[PDB]
CSV table of C-alpha atoms in Angstrom, one decimal:
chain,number,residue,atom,x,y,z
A,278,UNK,CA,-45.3,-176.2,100.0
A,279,UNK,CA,-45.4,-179.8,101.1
A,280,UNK,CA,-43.2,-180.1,103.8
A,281,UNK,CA,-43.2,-178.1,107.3
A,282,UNK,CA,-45.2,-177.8,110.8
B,293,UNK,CA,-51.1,-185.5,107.4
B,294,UNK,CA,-48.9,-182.5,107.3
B,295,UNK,CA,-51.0,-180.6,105.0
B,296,UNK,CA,-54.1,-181.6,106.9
B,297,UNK,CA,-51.9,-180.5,110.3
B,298,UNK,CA,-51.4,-177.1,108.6
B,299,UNK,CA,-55.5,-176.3,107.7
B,300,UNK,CA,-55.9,-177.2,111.2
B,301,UNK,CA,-53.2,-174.8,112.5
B,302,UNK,CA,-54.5,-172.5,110.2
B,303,UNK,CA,-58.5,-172.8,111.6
B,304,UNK,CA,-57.3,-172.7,114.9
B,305,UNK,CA,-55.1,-170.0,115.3
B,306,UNK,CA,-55.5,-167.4,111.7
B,307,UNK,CA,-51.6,-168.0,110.8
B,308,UNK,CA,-50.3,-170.0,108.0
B,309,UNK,CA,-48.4,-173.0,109.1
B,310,UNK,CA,-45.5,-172.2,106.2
B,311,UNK,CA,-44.7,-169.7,107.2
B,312,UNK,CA,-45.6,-169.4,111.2
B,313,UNK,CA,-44.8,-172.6,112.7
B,314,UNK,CA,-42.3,-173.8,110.0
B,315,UNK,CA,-39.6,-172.8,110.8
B,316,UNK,CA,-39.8,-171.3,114.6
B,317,UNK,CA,-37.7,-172.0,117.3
B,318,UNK,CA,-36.1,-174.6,117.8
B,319,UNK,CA,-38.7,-177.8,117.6
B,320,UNK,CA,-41.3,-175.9,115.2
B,321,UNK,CA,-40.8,-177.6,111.7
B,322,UNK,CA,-37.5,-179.2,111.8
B,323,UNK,CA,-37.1,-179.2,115.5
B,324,UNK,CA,-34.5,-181.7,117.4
B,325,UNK,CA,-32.1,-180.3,119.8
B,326,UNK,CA,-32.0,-177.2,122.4
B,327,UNK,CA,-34.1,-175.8,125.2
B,328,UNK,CA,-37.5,-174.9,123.7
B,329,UNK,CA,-37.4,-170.8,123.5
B,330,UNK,CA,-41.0,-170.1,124.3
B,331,UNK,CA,-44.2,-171.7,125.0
B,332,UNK,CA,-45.0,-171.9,121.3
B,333,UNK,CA,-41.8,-173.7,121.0
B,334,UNK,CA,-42.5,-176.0,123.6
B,335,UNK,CA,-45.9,-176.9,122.0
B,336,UNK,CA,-43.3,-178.4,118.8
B,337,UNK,CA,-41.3,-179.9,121.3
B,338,UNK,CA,-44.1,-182.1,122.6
B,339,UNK,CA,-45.4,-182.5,119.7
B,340,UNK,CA,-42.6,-184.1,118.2
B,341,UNK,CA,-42.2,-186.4,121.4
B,342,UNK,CA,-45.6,-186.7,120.6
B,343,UNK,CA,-44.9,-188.1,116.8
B,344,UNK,CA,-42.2,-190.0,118.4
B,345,UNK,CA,-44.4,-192.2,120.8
B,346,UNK,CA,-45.5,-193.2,117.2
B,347,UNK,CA,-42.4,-195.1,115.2
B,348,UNK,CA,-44.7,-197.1,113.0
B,349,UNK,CA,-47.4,-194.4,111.7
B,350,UNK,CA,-46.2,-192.0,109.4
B,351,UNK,CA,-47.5,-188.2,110.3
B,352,UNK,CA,-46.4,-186.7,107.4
B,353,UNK,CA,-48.7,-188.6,104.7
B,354,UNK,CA,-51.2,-190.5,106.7
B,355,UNK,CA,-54.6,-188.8,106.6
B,356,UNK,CA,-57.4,-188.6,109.7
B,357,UNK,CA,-60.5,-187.7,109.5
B,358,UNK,CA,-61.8,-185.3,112.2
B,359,UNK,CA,-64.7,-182.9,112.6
B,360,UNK,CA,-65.5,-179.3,114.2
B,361,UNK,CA,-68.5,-179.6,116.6
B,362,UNK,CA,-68.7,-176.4,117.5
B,363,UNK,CA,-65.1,-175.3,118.0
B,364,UNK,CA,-63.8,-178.4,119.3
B,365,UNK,CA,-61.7,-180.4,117.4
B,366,UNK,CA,-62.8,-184.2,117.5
B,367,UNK,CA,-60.9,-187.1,116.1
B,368,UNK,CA,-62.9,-189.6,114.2
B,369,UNK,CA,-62.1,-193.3,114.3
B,370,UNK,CA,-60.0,-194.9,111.8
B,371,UNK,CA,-57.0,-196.9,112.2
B,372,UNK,CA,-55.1,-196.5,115.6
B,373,UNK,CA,-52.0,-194.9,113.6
B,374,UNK,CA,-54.8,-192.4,112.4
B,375,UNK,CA,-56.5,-191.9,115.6
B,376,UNK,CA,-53.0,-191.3,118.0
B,377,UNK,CA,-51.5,-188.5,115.0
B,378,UNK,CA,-55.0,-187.0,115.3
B,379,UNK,CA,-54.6,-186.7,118.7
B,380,UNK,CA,-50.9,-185.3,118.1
B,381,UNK,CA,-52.0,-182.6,115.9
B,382,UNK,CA,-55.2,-182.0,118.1
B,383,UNK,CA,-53.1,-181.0,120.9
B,384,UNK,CA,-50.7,-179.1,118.8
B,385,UNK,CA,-53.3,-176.8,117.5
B,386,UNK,CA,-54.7,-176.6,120.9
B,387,UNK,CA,-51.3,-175.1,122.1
B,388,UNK,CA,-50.3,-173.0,119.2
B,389,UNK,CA,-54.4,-171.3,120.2
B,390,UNK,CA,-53.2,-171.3,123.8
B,391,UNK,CA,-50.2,-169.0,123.1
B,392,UNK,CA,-50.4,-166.9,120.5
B,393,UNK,CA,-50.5,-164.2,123.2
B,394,UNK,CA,-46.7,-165.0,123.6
B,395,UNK,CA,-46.1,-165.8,119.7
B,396,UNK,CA,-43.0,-163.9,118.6
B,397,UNK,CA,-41.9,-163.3,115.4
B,398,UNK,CA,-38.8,-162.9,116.1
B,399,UNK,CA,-38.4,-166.7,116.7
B,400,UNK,CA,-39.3,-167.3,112.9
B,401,UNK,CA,-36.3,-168.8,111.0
B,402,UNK,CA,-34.3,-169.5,114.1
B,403,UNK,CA,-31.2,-170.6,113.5
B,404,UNK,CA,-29.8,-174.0,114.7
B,405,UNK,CA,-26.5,-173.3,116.2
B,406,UNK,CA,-28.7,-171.5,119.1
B,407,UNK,CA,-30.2,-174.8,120.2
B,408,UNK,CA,-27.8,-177.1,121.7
B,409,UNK,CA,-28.3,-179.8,124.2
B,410,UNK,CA,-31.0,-183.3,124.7
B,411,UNK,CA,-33.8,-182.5,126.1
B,412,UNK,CA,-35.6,-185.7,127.1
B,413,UNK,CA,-39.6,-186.0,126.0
């Protein structure tokens, strides 16, 4: 999942 | 780092980043535009304000090194890029811990037409 806060 | 941002969220307050804090509100995730829907919300809107103080470091793939003493988060030194997006996702965390007790789930996947308007950081 590498995106995203 | 963002994935380093996201074992810290997840320490501090027991939710997964992807999905919690993804995608919520308006600022959490992809934020930009809109009045901030919650305290939670607001915590992304600094945040990013906070990233934004920061045009020459790179958040997403620059990695700090911090430690737990205790429960409090500490930022170690490395280079000043490092040290001020530690200090960004510090506070973050911090804030997300601060309001879970208003955390809704109902904010998750937000769509974007509901946020209009600049809100200056």
């Amino acid at each position: 999942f590498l995106a995203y806060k | 780092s963002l994935l380093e941002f996201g074992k810290m969220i997840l320490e501090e307050t027991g939710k997964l980043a992807i999905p919690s804090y993804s995608s919520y509100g308006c600022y959490c995730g992809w934020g930009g535009k809109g009045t901030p829907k919650d305290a939670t919300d607001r915590c992304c809107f600094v945040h990013d304000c906070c990233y934004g103080n920061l045009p020459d470091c790179n958040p997403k793939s620059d990695r700090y090194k911090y430690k737990r003493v205790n429960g409090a988060i500490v930022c170690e030194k490395g280079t000043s890029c490092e040290n001020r997006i530690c200090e960004c996702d510090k506070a973050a965390a911090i804030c997300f811990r601060q309001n879970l007790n208003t955390y809704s789930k109902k904010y998750m996947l937000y769509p974007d037409f509901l946020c209009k308007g600049e809100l200056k950081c």
